[PDB]
Write a protein that binds this ligand. Structure first.
Ligand SMILES: O=C1Nc2ccc(Cl)cc2[C@@](C#CC2CC2)(C(F)(F)F)O1
Ligand SMILES: [Ca+2]
Ligand SMILES: [Ca+2]
Lengths: 404, 544
DNA sequence: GTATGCCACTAGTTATTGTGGCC
RNA sequence: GAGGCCACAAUAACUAGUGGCAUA
């Protein structure tokens, strides 16, 4: 078996990411996993002359609490991006988002057979740390294509089409998409004979349930009141005035006109005819599909999340602020747990629709997220994330989305 | 045979070519004496014209900062060091200092030529004696990482046959610990010495081995306990900036085992630019703090090691003005370690929030030192915590803690209304400032026809919006509706601050506890919203 | 009038000084 | 050849993003 030469962009250095400290139960699990991977030739111990490093974690994965190892190849993936997108880019099927049911399968073990270019192995270095820095740190590097590196499916992609090409002739109205270590299978067939059709594929490759059209953007709905008070108008005006950055046709001019002079907040205010009309067009703008937003493939996707309270979270996927390609609500345990499942939901939905993962903006302190995110992580990829405040009007606006 | 480790220079760089300055005769006679012996033991070799490099002769024989800058990086070892509270109790402990550490590891052959150096001639009429290293040089960037790596391979077979014996490598030292009775421990120590000797590594014999306690990294390590080396914090009638820096260093060093240390008041005295000689007058609340610190440090303390079969308990206490201390223990009154947590300072933060960050810091430290998170005991009721975190935009998570009734508790001094108060007077507040003159005004107008404006000097837009809320509270009754366009001013009030550095916000918190019902609302500025418009015209008169 | 500062939240970076070590 | 190296801390500097405001 012959290796594809790989290379960093010619001004780049290798990953030198510091290892976040691990619990004893996960250091032990990693030591066990890595001696078995080394015993099978997949990784090799390295000396101190290798200066690179990439973080490593342990997650409970495959619905069973047998530990899995997750290497965080985010920095390496950025440093090899022209390799795995421009040169050997997997194409994304626009039809996949339209199948009535899509299941996801782990194709992770397939990389283990394929070797990895000699001159690239040093950049896959990682370090099992030790409690209280009491022992120096166990260093390895990959000899075979690593799960979690984006160049892995890029290299294995030519071999992957030959495993599935016989399947494609059989079921020509089934769509297969590969994103990193995952296979997304698209079918319009009934849910009962979907599982039989997705097993036979699973059985087929060993010899070597998403509903995307259920996803749908809900519209904003405004208060409906028999009586309006000064306070109700002021709250509504502040929201609609902010929301005009999203819907430029929204107007508050006839609502502000009702607030003449220095009124007590509880005073009742009869909506004049001009007010009733402005409110009624405002509603229709919000009930209509938002318009003027279109996906730009040269831009990063961004996912923002607001803690709504009582186990409820709102989220938006966009590229330019206020131009939402998608919005939605994730419902039900603790904040970190819920936030981890929201991030995973939004990322696979993002993989299905565009073939890319969004960069997340999370409403949590970094150090708390860095302590607990592997506690519930089940995915083989790790999105990019950063940590943000949530302005009050944002939370107040997306709290108005209609529920299923 | 210890195998060499391949070492390269940084991409694009050649080796050092620095000039050797002339030296005194009494210095050159000593150098040729040191160097001829190092040649006889094979650590260096005479070189000649074939070598174009040089590094000036100098602890260290040779000064390698140029070579070190051109040497490749290493993913380097002893990033952190153990903290003593993470070690386990032992019956017997030994420390072996490896004598000929670097002299016993051969340097990668093709790298040797870059370590060249010259002993110069006396009158410089002659050229000098030129040498290069065959072994790891003292002071070369790679020697620690390469020695450590070699020592780890040498210790693998011995570690494997002796699972019960813990060996920690630290620079040239081996710290060897066991639960064996002293005699059988000494049998193991000497087996370890023989193992090391096969590779040429020499260590002190039993007669020459130090006895506990061991001085290590400023700690004093016993088999069953640890302490810091004793702190001495001086007594001066005039304190200089450099002196105050020295005190905060000693105090922050002491705070890992001495509980309740506090530095926030001596830290304020180091703010601003000031020469290191400037005699700084101690503020008396700093003098008070320096006093209680001298009290803490007069008692003796020690920490205990970690029993991995008990839970760790962490307990936090509020110390006032954004300061917090904590204690980690597994058996009551037997601390593994203590520490402190201090807020940003300039900012005013809610006490539930400050407490949650203390927990966050302690949780991270605890995973580093023991590989598991503790059980917390916190001076906060489980429903005080619940009402605050369910009403806050940010997520957090403390897996397990419980209320412990040690005052000062943390509590929410006031509770704002969710709905406007019927029959209470509605105030519209506003402020205005000019940046050039730093002059401003703050005021309100009221649905019942009342209004006020006050003029402020040396102020900001942000201060005047708070002053305006200050006035509406000052001049209303126990129930009031207040309307502002400052999401800043409003956010300070909703995120109920602890007592802070600003007297304005402290007055406001005081005013708000005394109230009976308070509803606060935000409206956007410059929209023709009544009330807000009227008060804006008032307050902006002398200012725009 | 877009351009700024003002500070609350979020995230940092390079320098000095100090404590405790090391070379 | 004017000391570097590690952890922690303090200080200063450069801060940047989000938000509402405040003057032009
Ligand atoms: O785990 C333990 N327990 C322990 C107790 C007392 C002593 Cl004095 C020493 C130790 C030890 C160590 C060490 C380095 C911190 C110097 C030893 F390696 F065992 F020596 O580590
Ligand atoms: Ca204002
Ligand atoms: Ca105003």
């Amino acid at each position: 078996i012959e290796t594809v030469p790989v290379k960093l962009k010619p001004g780049m250095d290798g990953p030198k990411v510091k290892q976040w400290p691990l619990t004893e139960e996960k250091i032990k699990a990693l030591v066990e996993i890595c001696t078995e991977m080394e015993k099978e030739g997949k990784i090799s111990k390295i000396g101190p002359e290798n200066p690179y490093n990439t973080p490593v974690f342990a997650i409970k994965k495959k619905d069973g609490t047998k530990w899995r190892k997750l290497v965080d190849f985010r920095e390496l993936n950025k440093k090899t991006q022209d390799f795995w997108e421009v040169q050997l880019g997997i194409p994304h099927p626009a039809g996949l988002k339209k199948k009535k049911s899509v299941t996801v399968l782990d194709v992770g073990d397939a990389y283990f057979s394929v070797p990895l270019d000699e001159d690239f192995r040093k950049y896959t270095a990682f370090t099992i740390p030790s409690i209280n820095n009491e022992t120096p740190g166990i260093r390895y590097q990959y000899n075979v294509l690593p799960q979690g590196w984006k160049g892995s499916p890029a290299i294995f992609q030519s071999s992957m089409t030959k495993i599935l090409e016989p399947f494609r002739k059989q079921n020509p109205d089934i769509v297969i998409y590969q994103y990193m270590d995952d296979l997304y299978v698209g079918s319009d067939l009934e849910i009962g004979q979907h599982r039989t059709k997705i097993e036979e594929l699973r059985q087929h490759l060993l010899r070597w349930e998403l509903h995307p059209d259920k996803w749908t953007v809900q519209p904003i709905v405004l208060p409906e009141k028999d009586s309006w008070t000064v306070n109700d108008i002021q709250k509504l005006v502040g929201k609609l005035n902010w929301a005009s950055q999203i819907y430029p046709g929204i107007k508050v001019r006839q609502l502000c006109k009702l607030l003449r002079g220095t009124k007590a907040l509880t005073e009742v205010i009869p909506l004049t005819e001009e007010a009733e009309l402005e409110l009624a067009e405002n509603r229709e703008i919000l009930k209509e599909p938002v318009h003027g937003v279109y996906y730009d493939p040269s831009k990063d996707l961004i996912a923002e999340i607001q803690k709504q309270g009582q186990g409820q979270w709102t989220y938006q996927i966009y590229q330019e602020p206020f131009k939402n390609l998608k919005t939605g609500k994730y419902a039900r345990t603790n904040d970190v747990k819920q936030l981890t499942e929201a991030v995973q939901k939004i990322t696979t939905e993002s993989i299905v629709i565009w073939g890319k993962t969004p960069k997340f903006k999370l409403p949590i302190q970094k150090e708390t997220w860095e302590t607990w995110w592997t506690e519930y992580w089940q995915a083989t990829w790790v999105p990019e994330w950063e940590f943000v405040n949530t302005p009050p009007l944002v939370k107040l606006w997306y709290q108005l989305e209609k529920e299923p | 045979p210890i195998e060499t480790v391949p070492v390269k220079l940084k991409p694009g760089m050649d080796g050092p070519k620095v000039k050797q300055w002339p030296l005194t005769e009494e210095k050159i006679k000593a150098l040729v004496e040191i160097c001829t012996e190092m040649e006889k033991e094979g650590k260096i070799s005479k070189i000649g014209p074939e070598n174009p490099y040089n590094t000036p002769v100098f602890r260290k024989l040779v000064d390698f900062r140029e070579l070190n800058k051109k040497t490749q990086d290493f993913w380097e070892v002893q990033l952190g060091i153990p903290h003593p509270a993470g070690l386990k109790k032992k019956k017997s402990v030994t420390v072996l200092d490896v004598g000929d550490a670097y002299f016993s590891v051969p340097l990668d052959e093709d790298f040797r030529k870059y370590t060249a150096f010259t002993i110069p001639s006396i009158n410089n009429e002659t050229p000098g004696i030129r040498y290069q290293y065959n072994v790891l040089p003292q002071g070369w960037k790679g020697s620690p990482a390469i020695f450590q790596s070699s020592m780890t391979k040498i210790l693998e077979p011995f570690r494997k046959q002796n699972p019960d014996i813990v060996i920690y490598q630290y620079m040239d030292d081996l710290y060897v610990g066991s639960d064996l009775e002293i005699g059988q421990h000494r049998t193991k120590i000497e087996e370890l010495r023989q193992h090391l000797l096969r590779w040429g590594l020499t260590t002190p014999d039993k007669k020459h081995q130090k006895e506990p306690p061991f001085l290590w990294m400023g700690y004093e390590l016993h088999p069953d306990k640890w302490t810091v080396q004793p702190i001495v914090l001086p007594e001066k009638d005039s304190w200089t900036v450099n002196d105050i820096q020295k005190l905060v260093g000693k105090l922050n060093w002491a705070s890992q085992i001495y509980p309740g240390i506090k530095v926030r008041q001596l830290c304020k005295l180091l703010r601003g630019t000031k020469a290191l000689t400037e005699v700084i007058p101690l503020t008396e609340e700093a003098e008070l703090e320096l006093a209680e610190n001298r009290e803490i440090l007069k008692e003796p303390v020690h920490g205990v090691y970690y029993d991995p079969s008990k839970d760790l308990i962490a307990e936090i206490q509020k110390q006032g003005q954004g300061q917090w201390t904590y204690q980690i223990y597994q058996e009551p009154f037997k601390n593994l370690k203590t520490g402190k947590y201090a807020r940003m300072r300039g900012a005013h933060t809610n006490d539930v929030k400050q407490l949650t960050e203390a927990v966050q810091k302690i949780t991270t430290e605890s995973i580093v030192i023991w590989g598991k998170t503790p059980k917390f005991k916190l001076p906060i009721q489980k429903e005080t915590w619940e009402t605050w975190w369910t009403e806050y935009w940010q997520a957090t998570w403390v897996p397990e803690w419980e209320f412990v009734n040690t005052p000062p508790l943390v509590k929410l001094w006031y509770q704002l209304e969710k709905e406007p108060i019927v029959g209470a007077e509605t105030f519209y507040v506003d402020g205005a400032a000019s940046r050039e003159t730093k002059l401003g005004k703050a005021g309100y107008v009221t649905n019942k026809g009342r209004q006020k404006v006050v003029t402020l000097t040396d102020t900001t837009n942000q201060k005047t919006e708070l002053q305006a809320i200050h006035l509406a509270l000052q001049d209303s009754g126990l129930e009031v509706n207040i309307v502002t366009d400052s999401q800043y001013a409003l956010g300070i009030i909703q995120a109920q601050p602890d007592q802070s550095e600003s007297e304005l916000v402290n007055q406001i918190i005081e005013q708000l506890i005394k109230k009976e019902k308070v509803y606060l609302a935000w409206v956007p500025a410059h929209k023709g919203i009544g009330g807000n418009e009227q008060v804006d015209k008032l307050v902006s008169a002398g200012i725009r």
